[PDB]
Amino acid sequence: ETLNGGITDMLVELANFEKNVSQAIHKYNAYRKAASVIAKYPHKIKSGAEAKKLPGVGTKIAEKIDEFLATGKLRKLEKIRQDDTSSSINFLTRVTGIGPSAARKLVDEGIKTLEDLRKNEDKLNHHQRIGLKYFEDFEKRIPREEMLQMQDIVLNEVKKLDPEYIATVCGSFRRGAESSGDMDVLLTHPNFTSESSKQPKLLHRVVEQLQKVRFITDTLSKGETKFMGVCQLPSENEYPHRRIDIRLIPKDQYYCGVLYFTGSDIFNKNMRAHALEKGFTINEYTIRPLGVTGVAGEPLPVDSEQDIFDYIQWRYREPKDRSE
DNA sequence: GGGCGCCG
DNA sequence: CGGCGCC
Ligand SMILES: Nc1ccn([C@H]2CC[C@@H](COP(=O)(O)OP(=O)(O)OP(=O)(O)O)O2)c(=O)n1
Ligand SMILES: [Mg+2]
Ligand SMILES: [Mg+2]
């Protein structure tokens, strides 16, 4: 029965291609949107020119409409049958360590399932191995109360080695969310500052410590600044493996760090992006005027997150507000 | 946007 | 050493 059936069908097929074969969210979005609106319409759609009228649809859609009208065809649309690589690839990407590039290669060699991975372990680099090892684990968000305990344990043991050590937990957590992807933690130490730019050792000790207590349980990397690894809560008879990140910022550049580690990522993007519009360039370490020629001037002093915002002419926004 | 570590 | 995956 349904008049515009035929069309809406196409339309929807179309959006999902746009959705997957691309990023083309904007496209896909109008796409469905439209199919939706033509769909609510109570008259048979005859002319694409009629369609246009209806809100949601426009030129580009109306065209696609036409080509369908005369002939069920849609050469573009016919093209579609290319399929399957794309489904599987992305999937693989869900694997921590697996980027689009290693995902491709993995698919080309026929590895393109979860099951398959497990079978082709030998092809995986270490990180991948882990992502793979703790796969199901990595898909669960940490709940507030958990982080809590973790905040605790980190907090504590940090003190034991030195109580001069400062540890702040950023990212989601700090922005107040109810569930957090991982645990992100800023670490600082006054012995360490913009003048020395050394002491990998501080971080170093600390991971070993947590390590030596069965907290961290794996290691994805260990720089003289960064640190990503797995960790886990304890119990009697167990808690899911979590992703952990430590970053050591020279005690003197704590604020740039804090801002940056709090995110959100989008926020940072907009913000950093903005500093520029204003003439300064911001990194986890500093905010320094950015010179006429296009080179970084000396770094403006910072005494609190507020000041960063003051510089780019922006209203301070609480962490909980830095969503974007 | 701006940058850290590891791959091979 | 680039480039990758990640933050
Ligand atoms: N591409 C990125 C990623 C992060 N940052 C910052 C934002 C905070 C931290 C990223 O931590 P994530 O754990 O990626 O984000 P989150 O806020 O912790 O989110 P989740 O809930 O997923 O852990 O690095 C940035 O400037 N650019
Ligand atoms: Mg987080
Ligand atoms: Mg993280």
Domain with A59 in it: what CATH number? 1.10.150.110
Binding site listing of A for Mg(2+):
182, 184, 245
Within this chain, do residues A145 and A256 fall inside the same structural domain, yes or no?
yes
CA distances from A142 to A17, A155, A242 (A): 33, 18, 8
Within this chain, do residues A151 and A250 fall inside the same structural domain, yes or no?
yes
A221 Cβ nearer than 7 Å to chain B strand: yes
Within this chain, do residues A148 and A251 fall inside the same structural domain, yes or no?
yes
Under a CB-based contact definition with an 8 Å cutoff, are residues A255 and A304 in contact?
Answer: yes
Contacts of A22 (CB under 8 A, 6+ apart): A28
The residues of A annotated as belonging to the active site are: 64
User: In a 3-state reduction of DSSP, which class is residue A229?
Assistant: strand
Please report, for the domain that includes residue A114, its CATH number: 1.10.150.20
Q: Which nucleotides of C are covered by protein (CB under 7 A)?
A: 3-7
User: How far, in Å, CA of A158 to CA of A150, rounded?
Assistant: 12
Within this chain, do residues A153 and A238 fall inside the same structural domain, yes or no?
yes
Question: Which of A83, A98, A123 delimits the end of a domain?
Answer: A83
Within this chain, do residues A162 and A272 fall inside the same structural domain, yes or no?
no
**Domain carrying residue A273:** 261-324
Number of domains chain A is built from: 4
Question: Which of A140, A158, A187 delimits the end of a domain?
Answer: A140
Please report, for the domain that includes residue A250, its CATH number: 3.30.460.10
Tokens of A159: 């003190």
Protein residue closest via CA to atom 8 of ligand 1: A263
Query: Which of A51, A54, A53, A48 has its CA nearest to residue A69?
Result: A48
Q: Cα of A172 to ligand 3 centre, how many Å?
A: 9
Under a CB-based contact definition with an 8 Å cutoff, are residues A163 and A147 in contact?
Answer: no
Query: Which of A118, A119, A113, A120 has its CA nearest to residue A94?
Result: A113
**Using a 6 Å cutoff on CB, does residue A96 contact ligand 1?**
no
Within this chain, do residues A223 and A266 fall inside the same structural domain, yes or no?
no
The residue written with tokens 């090892």 in the block is A133
A129 Cβ nearer than 7 Å to chain B strand: no
Which bin fits A97, alpha (ψ -120 to 50), beta or left (φ > 0)?
Answer: left
Within this chain, do residues A113 and A194 fall inside the same structural domain, yes or no?
no
**Using a 6 Å cutoff on CB, does residue A181 contact ligand 1?**
yes
Contacts of A187 (CB under 8 A, 6+ apart): A158, A165, A166, A167, A168, A202, A203, A206, A246, A247, A248, A249
Resolution (A): 2.9
Q: Method used for this model?
A: X-ray
Q: What angle do CA A282, A180, A316 make, to 5 degrees?
A: 35
Q: For residues A121-141, b (16+ Cβ closer than 10 Å) or e, as one string?
A: eeebeebbbbbbbbbeebeee
* Residue to mutate (ligand 1; options A265, A269, A270, A281; most atoms within 8 A of CB): A265
Phi, psi values for residue A156, rounded to 5°: -55, -80
User: In a 3-state reduction of DSSP, which class is residue A289?
Assistant: strand
Question: Which of A66, A83, A100 delimits the end of a domain?
Answer: A83
A224 Cβ nearer than 7 Å to chain B strand: yes
User: How far, in Å, CA of A269 to CA of A279, rounded?
Assistant: 15
Within this chain, do residues A254 and A145 fall inside the same structural domain, yes or no?
yes
Can you give the length of chain A in residues? Answer: 324
Within this chain, do residues A4 and A60 fall inside the same structural domain, yes or no?
yes
DSSP annotation of A321: G
Contacts of A248 (CB under 8 A, 6+ apart): A187, A188, A189, A192, A202, A203, A225, A226, A227
Strands (E), chain A: 142-143, 166-169, 179-180, 183-188, 216-222, 226-231, 242-248, 280-282, 287-289
Within this chain, do residues A152 and A253 fall inside the same structural domain, yes or no?
yes
A99 Cβ nearer than 7 Å to chain C strand: yes
Within this chain, do residues A218 and A176 fall inside the same structural domain, yes or no?
yes
Within this chain, do residues A303 and A199 fall inside the same structural domain, yes or no?
no
Please report, for the domain that includes residue A318, its CATH number: 3.30.210.10
